[PDB]
Symmetry: C3
Subunit: 91 residues, 3 copies
């Protein structure tokens, strides 16, 4: 990402150097700079996609967190019942 902004920085310069005084070799140099920048972009996209695997892992944990919560609240519902039966048993 820091590589990207710099790589884009270099790329704007080569463009500027190309704009002020064209040349065929300067053109090919620009295209080479573009390819290298695109290469870094693809690497940034790859890393993002890899990092996004956590999204799936987070979603699975939430689901299990919710499943455990539902079980707790059914128990609490049954536990609330037991106490009322207990109190009324006493009086």
């Amino acid at each position: 990402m820091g590589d990207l902004k710099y790589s884009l920085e270099r790329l704007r310069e080569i463009l500027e150097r190309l704009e002020e005084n064209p040349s065929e070799k300067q053109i090919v140099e620009a295209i080479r700079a573009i390819v290298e920048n695109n290469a870094q972009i693809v690497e940034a996209i790859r890393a993002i996609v890899e990092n996004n695997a956590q999204i799936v892992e987070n979603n699975r944990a939430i689901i299990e967190a919710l499943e455990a919560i539902g079980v707790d609240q059914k128990i609490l519902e049954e536990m609330k019942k037991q106490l009322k039966d207990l109190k009324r048993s006493l009086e």
Copy 2:
């Protein structure tokens, strides 16, 4: 992602063919390949942006999970007091 890497390697190859034997038609070739590669990069980003909606959906679910937990803990706090009174009352 796989399309990206191949599309980038196609792109690197054309650059090579351009570097070894420069030409105007080969320059336009290169630029067309770049535009094609950029087009695939954009689709990759759009798909990533689409997938990122799960982040929001995950965040909403965690919040609801925490809200349900706080409720359970409040109930448990009251339940614990009920048993203290029940036991103390009996003994």
Copy 3:
């Protein structure tokens, strides 16, 4: 993202204009359009990376939720014991 598609479409048209009748000036203009498109792509990548920090914050929140649940279930395990002992006693 809306900028990207337009930026790419502008780029596609310049290519066509370049393909209509090649020219150095047209070549240089195309390379600039690519640079501008790449510049928008990087900004898009930055925005995604910034947005991705929510993934970490979600993960931390899930962990704290799970930790809180485990505490509840240990308590519930103890509370179920109390009622059993209470009922049997009485």
